[PDB]
Amino acid sequence: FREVVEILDGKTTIIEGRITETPQESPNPPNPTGQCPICRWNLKHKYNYEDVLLLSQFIRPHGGMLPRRITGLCQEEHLKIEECVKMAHRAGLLPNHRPKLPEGFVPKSKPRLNRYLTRWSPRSVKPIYNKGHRWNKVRMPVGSPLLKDNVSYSGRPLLLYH
Amino acid sequence: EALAGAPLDNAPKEYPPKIQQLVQDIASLTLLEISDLNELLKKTL
Amino acid sequence: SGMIRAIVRAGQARPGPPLGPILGQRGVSINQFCKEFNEKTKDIKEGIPLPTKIFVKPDRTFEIKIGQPTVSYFLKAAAGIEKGARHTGKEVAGLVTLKHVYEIARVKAQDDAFALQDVPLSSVVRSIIGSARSLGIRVVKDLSSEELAAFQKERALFLAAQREADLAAQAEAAKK
Amino acid sequence: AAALARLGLRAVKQVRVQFCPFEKNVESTRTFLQAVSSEKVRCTNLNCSVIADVRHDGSEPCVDVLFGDGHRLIMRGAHLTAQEMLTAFASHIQARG
Amino acid sequence: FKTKGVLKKRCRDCYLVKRRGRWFIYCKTNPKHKQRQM
Amino acid sequence: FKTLLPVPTFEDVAIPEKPKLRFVERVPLVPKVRRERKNLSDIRGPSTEATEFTEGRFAILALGGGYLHWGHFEMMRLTINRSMDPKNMFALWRVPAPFKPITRKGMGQRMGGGKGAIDHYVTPVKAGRLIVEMGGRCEFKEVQGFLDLVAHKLPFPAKAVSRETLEKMRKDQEERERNNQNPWTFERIATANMLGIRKVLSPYDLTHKGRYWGKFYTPERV
Amino acid sequence: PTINPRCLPPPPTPPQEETGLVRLLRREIAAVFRDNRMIAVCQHVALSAEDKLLLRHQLRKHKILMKIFPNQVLKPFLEESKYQNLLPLFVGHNLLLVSEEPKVKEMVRILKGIPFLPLLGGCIDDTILSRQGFINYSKLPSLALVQGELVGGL
Amino acid sequence: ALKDPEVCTDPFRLTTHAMGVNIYKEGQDVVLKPDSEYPEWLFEMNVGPPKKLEELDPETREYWRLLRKHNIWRHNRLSKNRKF
RNA sequence: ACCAUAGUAGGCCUAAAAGCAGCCAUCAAUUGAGAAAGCGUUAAAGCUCAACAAAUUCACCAACAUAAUCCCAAAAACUAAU
């Protein structure tokens, strides 16, 4: 990993990049012939938003997500990983990946409401004032359709809209 | 084949070996051959 | 402050259009151009078009450089026709030999457009041929006086038919 | 290159570029040099001199800039990318102007 | 703004952006190009 | 540096005289003084007439069924004429002039008395029938631009299609029907009279194979 | 499908066919690297159209020509050739200077007239030089002068 | 009011002298030299219609020169539906 | 992203038609760039898009307002289901 250092020394600015040692991939994957990293370790259709140990290897230190070009994930899996990271952050997990702002932490606000499997964002959903009867029912979404292909040990389909 | 490594002037210390062996070959000749070598060079150049 | 592309007759800078409104818009009087350009060339007949480059400076001063005339005037004069063909391709306006195109090449080879690039002699002649493609004048390998004369009579008859047709066409539009 | 033109390079006194073209980590320096030496950037002040120093065994691709205020911006670009170098150069112009 | 059904770019400077759960056409040069999906 | 792909060459296409669309009369020259029943079987089901290209290479394919009257003809004619190049484009009608009368009784009167007076004339159009066929020496991309506008304003849903595109969607309607992994299909159940389903289905559903319901055609049903 | 084809290893790579344009550049690069004694590389810089044309005219006065070749057909060619050591100079934007009967005294002078036109390096008579080598080569006398002084020293 | 100067109409002089070449008042008509003295390359150019796509050769820059021109024509036609 | 130079105000046309009312032709310099794809000008000038080079994740298409006494089972994405 590379980091940028900017130093001010008597009206003179020096900017330089330093290389930090980077952890490497594990030696033996179960499926050496795979293309994308997800299917190389037989992780296809076997991860969810709870799997922090997996979603913490495809995100930036400040909560952002790395581009698909660097990681090498396929387009189908990259969107699923992107969706899980968004759901993971809203769920309260990954507390060390937030930006540091000393001035904003002191003015506390209303206590955080615990949530999980939030498809949308908290500030972009409007109350369902007129729900409706059973023949035309406005169903609150839970989870994402991108995760409907995950393995179901019970065998019953996941209820995405409820 | 390949070309040379393009040495720089920061640490210029390695002269071509073809020149060095020419120096040894020239120095390995008698004065009579010096005149013959000189006359041929003068006639050609 | 900019560059002005103007075609002016040799030593015939008039105090009006198209020189007046264009050159005077940048803030340069015409009387200045009535002395600079007219005295710039005095051995060139008036009435011959001359594409000139005018560089207007921020202090309202100007610089003038004169180039070779346009290809259109050279080929029309070489073919002896007063104007180009109205319908290029359908009709041939004038007939010229390869000498006229080749001889024009040397005259335009010293133009600032071509001489700066140091283009070969084959480069200029092809451009003149290409310009002749849209000008209506066909390049001929070689012809004589009688072959050229026959074309003149045929062109005159077709021109005369069009000249009288235009007069009738104008009359129809006005009356109707 | 287009970014520098819009930000007014007139407040820049002198820019020099020192790099070894035969090295492997000088591609970023080359891209920075071509962006700052573009025609659009040039046509902003007719006194600034752009110097392209070329060496072989220097092994230190560096860029040095002097602003009108009098600050010395020197960034040794060997691991930095072209975008980072331009962004840092562009940022200082607004502050020191 | 202009509440419309389908969003189209009237000039090449219009850029799409999704805010508050809806797609907005925001334009910098011409403010009259601002459009809002309903 | 990129690859210089060859460009299509169109030199064997001849532009016929009067390439613009022919005017269509509002009413047929000989009016029909006898009012006939409003057949609805002329819309239901697939089309059997004018399903293949004759001269041109582009056409508007009618996915659904509907009625075209003189108003729609004017919209099709005016839009194409002012948007195409007469030197490189020629268009041909694929539907006849309006001939079927439509009856409208007087405003606000009690039911009964009989059929009213003839109001206007319409042209029945089934599903899969080309409407306007265009050809020329130009590529499909530019022709598609101003044909979707005409197809959008038609009553029935329609698309702008060409020779290659039409075959591709017909060669995909067969592959999707051959590789289907569902053991039961509408064709198998209806014909064999399984579950006594003939009491619910219509006799025309034997031929429609379940792809047609009323005037609506759903191409995704196998 | 049991396994998605994306996760499966890719099919055998189709053999790409070189077109005429690519093969035309292959022989022109071979030609310009064969009959020309001086090959000087440069970093192409976006200059004014009038200034760029002026540079062409000035180099024409000393019989010096300049050509531009894309890296798509030049890097593979130089890799298999004997000038593989010039690959680091052909990574980014580049410009090639071609001359017969090499003489860099009138070439460096034009280059030094524009302070933002770097001279990376090049090969002169199958000998790779840096900018400093070019400067030393410029101040060096010609063959007649050097050989004329050679007999004096001997 | 601005018109080109009167041109020669004699076929004999036009076939032997190019009047339009001499634009100087003090200059004179340049006499035609024998065609043998003329360089041979001026009798080799395509006098007639321009070369088509097939008359050229794939192993020649002329084919790619014309194919490049055709690509621009194809791109221009497809751009007729610009809304910007 | 980057980047724009030749014949040349092409002929004709018009009060003026300079790639950009229309007609006609659509050749040609340069490794590279259309007698022009769009904007603009009274006409010019000018901006932009194709072509140089540089460079290379992917990018066809899929957006649609509201009713009157008070919303309307409560709630739930995995412990094994022909």
Ligand code: FES
């Ligand atoms: S390529 Fe197999 S899961 Fe990504």
Ligand SMILES: [K+]
């Ligand atoms: K519709």
Ligand SMILES: [K+]
């Ligand atoms: K015009």
Ligand SMILES: [Mg+2]
């Ligand atoms: Mg060309």
Ligand SMILES: [Mg+2]
């Ligand atoms: Mg471009």
Ligand SMILES: [Mg+2]
């Ligand atoms: Mg409303």
Ligand SMILES: [Mg+2]
């Ligand atoms: Mg209740």
Ligand SMILES: [Zn+2]
């Ligand atoms: Zn806009």
